[PDB]
Design a protein around this ligand. Structure first.
Ligand SMILES: [Mg+2]
Ligand SMILES: [Mg+2]
Ligand SMILES: [Mg+2]
Ligand SMILES: [Mg+2]
Ligand SMILES: [Mg+2]
Ligand SMILES: [Mg+2]
Ligand SMILES: [Mg+2]
Ligand SMILES: [Mg+2]
Ligand SMILES: [Mg+2]
Ligand SMILES: [Mg+2]
Ligand SMILES: [Mg+2]
Ligand SMILES: [Mg+2]
Ligand SMILES: [Mg+2]
Ligand SMILES: [Mg+2]
Ligand SMILES: [Mg+2]
Ligand SMILES: [Mg+2]
Ligand SMILES: [Mg+2]
Ligand SMILES: [Mg+2]
Ligand SMILES: [Mg+2]
Ligand SMILES: [Mg+2]
Lengths: 175, 52, 34, 126, 49
RNA sequence: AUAUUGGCGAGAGACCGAUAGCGAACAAGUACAGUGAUGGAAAGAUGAAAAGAACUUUGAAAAGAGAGUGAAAAAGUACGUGAAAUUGUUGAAAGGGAAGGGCAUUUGAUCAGACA
RNA sequence: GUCGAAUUUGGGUAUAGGGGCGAAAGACUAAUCGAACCAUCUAGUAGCUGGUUCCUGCCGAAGUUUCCCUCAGGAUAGCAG
RNA sequence: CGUGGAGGUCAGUGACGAAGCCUAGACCGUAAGGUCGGGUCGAACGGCCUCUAGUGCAGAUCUUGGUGGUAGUAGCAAAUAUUCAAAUGAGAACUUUGAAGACUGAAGUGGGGAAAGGUUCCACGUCAACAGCAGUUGGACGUGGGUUAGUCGAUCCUAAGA
């Protein structure tokens, strides 16, 4: 429990989450944003194509000195990548959310990703030895990922006396 | 206690060392090594004007 | 709203809901006594 | 107000003595008052609780339940009664930890030393 | 047995986040290395190349 | 009759309240470091009671979702409260080589008093 | 560069800090040598640098005089209460 | 004006919610600050008259702890070199077997020892952490097994020395 945002009418929604996952937070944020708001089956097929390198995850925020590719033109960008580990974690959470929706009895062809959210888990703090006898940090940035899929469903005016008289006179002048 | 904050073997690393000149704990192999000591502004140091 | 009967961040905890129920019973007892 | 110089009103010392009392001291610390019937019958008010005496719960959610003491768990300052349990769906029964100050003894387990203790406290049995 | 196993697995988490080799990895890093923070190199001999 | 920062046993405080108070409230002169003499940390708080989440379902599993225990899981052995820096999502807004501030008003949003 | 000797090297042993050892470079003496390392006296010494924590009200200065021979460091006088 | 503690009082506040914290809400002070509403929270706390002080921070290349941008960036390019199939497994560039190509080239990338280390040896189980990619593998994790002397050494002798 305690998601970042909940759905009103929880009977038409399913949720999934995964915490302390040893996967890059920046890549996972890009993947989740690339998936945000889509229909569930379309999102799953898109992630399969990303794994097959036929389509790409556009990289919008954490994208300094990334290479350029022609597959970002689908989303009006030049910088996109294919983060396999992030795609696999998000695929696992999508499969779990679909299973939870099926257990609830929701129509699986009307489900869309109404909420998805990645934030930073506590860091994995390895260290390396460096020149002149130094110790430098060597850290993994893990993710907390959560998502909610939702079944998509298809004035007194105050007038002054002058205004009231004007309206009455217009009414008398007209029909 | 009149010995509180004084049971420490610490010395200043000198001027021009890119760090503050507060005395620092010597030795090695523990997190205490290199930490400031003896100061009233220092964690674990002696209080200003200890009560008598 | 839950007594009468998208994505939101407004939730009611069970702790607070039980406290509201208890306080409402207090107020209703006062109303019946007056 | 205390008058002896050999007794301490220090809260820290009292709490340390309570939480580090040995088993024989905890036996005295775990005392239960008698029922009204037993108090009239024996002429004493409270006794240390032991394994085979029957009790009535007079405080808490289990108030009114009767049973026989199942154990005196002195290590956790509690007693266990056989009939007072928390039950689960899978068939698990966990004894409720009751404090003897919240219990009332309705029937004493009487042996030679118990009779001697009652008499030396001032009892009038038989 | 499974209860104690879960207790041990839960207790392992902080050391595993600090990436210790096990219970036996108890390396302690100093706060400041004097040979790294005592550099004042005049015209002459230095302490490193 | 006087001394007493050691030892044993006691009683107290307008003292400190976990970066404080002894270095040490905890398996602390420990862990760790150093050939050695020596140097020397960090680290307290689920709950009244472990009742510490049975059972079902998805997953290779960690786990998730239902369910359940409990006053509370906005207490899940990462556990009382749970600030700031810093971060994610949502909503609103601004942006032609910084931003922030003062006076004044427009626009949008939002709101208290006074109403016999 | 030198490579069969003033050669290279293991182990044992001896020499210890105002001392040793030195085919002499103030070289080396456990990453420490114009003085090894460790603890204590010890919170050692300041001509100097840096910092020094709430508000408002009212009053509000000082480089101009004589001296200790003159630097330095002090005294007096002046100004504000 | 504000803070820790202390004497007195308000027979003060409080499980119908104390303190703390958050707040697009309200008010009083020139101000230091004070007061009220909502949320969160779960057991103590304040007004006034006085006492007392380890009593108020933006700085000190301040102390301790925590966190950013840099940045998914620099980089993971010495030691010629890997490939195919099957098996195992959820998952195989990295495990195992077979099939190949190479290399050390006897001053070895072979076979033993001394110093040092101390169980790392071997078997079974086994993957959270570690092996700067990976991992079903391991000098890793868990549980055990293993070192047999009249003849090999110490032990005995003496060397410089103590
Ligand atoms: Mg580049
Ligand atoms: Mg090195
Ligand atoms: Mg101290
Ligand atoms: Mg301490
Ligand atoms: Mg908490
Ligand atoms: Mg913040
Ligand atoms: Mg531009
Ligand atoms: Mg020659
Ligand atoms: Mg409150
Ligand atoms: Mg102070
Ligand atoms: Mg500050
Ligand atoms: Mg300042
Ligand atoms: Mg600084
Ligand atoms: Mg690169
Ligand atoms: Mg190579
Ligand atoms: Mg060859
Ligand atoms: Mg061998
Ligand atoms: Mg082996
Ligand atoms: Mg790795
Ligand atoms: Mg082993």
């Amino acid at each position: 429990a305690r998601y970042g945002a909940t759905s009103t009418n929880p009977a038409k929604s399913a949720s999934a989450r995964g915490s302390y996952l040893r996967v890059s937070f920046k890549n996972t944020r890009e993947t989740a944003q690339a998936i945000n708001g889509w229909e569930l089956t379309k999102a799953q097929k898109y992630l399969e194509q990303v794994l097959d390198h036929q389509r790409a995850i556009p990289f919008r925020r954490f994208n300094s000195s990334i290479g350029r590719t022609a597959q970002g033109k689908e989303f009006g960008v030049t910088k996109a990548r294919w983060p396999a580990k992030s795609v696999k974690f998000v695929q696992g959470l999508l499969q779990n959310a679909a299973a939870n929706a099926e257990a609830k009895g929701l129509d699986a062809t009307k489900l869309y990703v109404s909420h998805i959210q990645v934030n930073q888990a506590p860091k994995q703090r390895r260290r390396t030895y460096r020149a002149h006898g130094r110790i430098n940090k060597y850290e993994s940035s893990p993710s907390h990922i959560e998502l909610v899929v939702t079944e998509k469903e298809e004035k007194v005016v105050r007038l002054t006396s002058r205004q009231r008289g004007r309206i009455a006179a217009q009414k008398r002048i007209a029909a | 206690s009149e010995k509180a904050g004084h049971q420490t073997s610490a010395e200043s690393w000198g001027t021009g060392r890119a760090v503050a000149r507060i005395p620092r704990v010597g030795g090695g192999g523990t997190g205490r090594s290199g930490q400031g000591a003896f100061g009233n502004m220092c964690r674990g140091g002696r209080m200003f004007a200890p009560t008598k | 709203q839950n007594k009468k009967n998208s994505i939101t961040t407004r939730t009611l905890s069970k702790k607070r809901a039980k406290k509201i129920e208890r306080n409402l019973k207090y107020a209703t007892q006062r109303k019946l006594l007056v | 107000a205390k008058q002896s110089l050999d007794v301490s009103s220090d809260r820290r010392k009292a709490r340390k003595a309570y939480f580090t009392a040995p088993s024989s001291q905890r036996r005295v610390l775990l005392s239960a008052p008698l029922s009204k019937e037993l108090r009239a019958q024996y002429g004493i008010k409270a006794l240390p609780i032991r394994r085979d005496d029957e009790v009535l719960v007079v405080r808490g959610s289990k108030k009114g339940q009767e049973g026989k003491i199942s154990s005196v768990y002195r290590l956790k300052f509690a007693v266990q009664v056989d009939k007072v349990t928390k039950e689960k769906v899978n068939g698990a029964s966990v004894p409720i930890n009751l404090h003897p100050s919240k219990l009332v003894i309705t029937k004493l387990h009487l042996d030679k030393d118990r009779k001697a203790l009652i008499q030396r406290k001032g009892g009038k049995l038989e | 047995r499974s209860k104690a196993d879960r207790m041990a697995k839960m207790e392992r988490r902080e050391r595993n986040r600090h990436a210790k080799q096990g219970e036996s990895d108890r390396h302690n890093a100093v706060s400041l290395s004097k040979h790294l923070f005592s550099g004042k190199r005049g015209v002459g001999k230095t302490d490193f190349r």
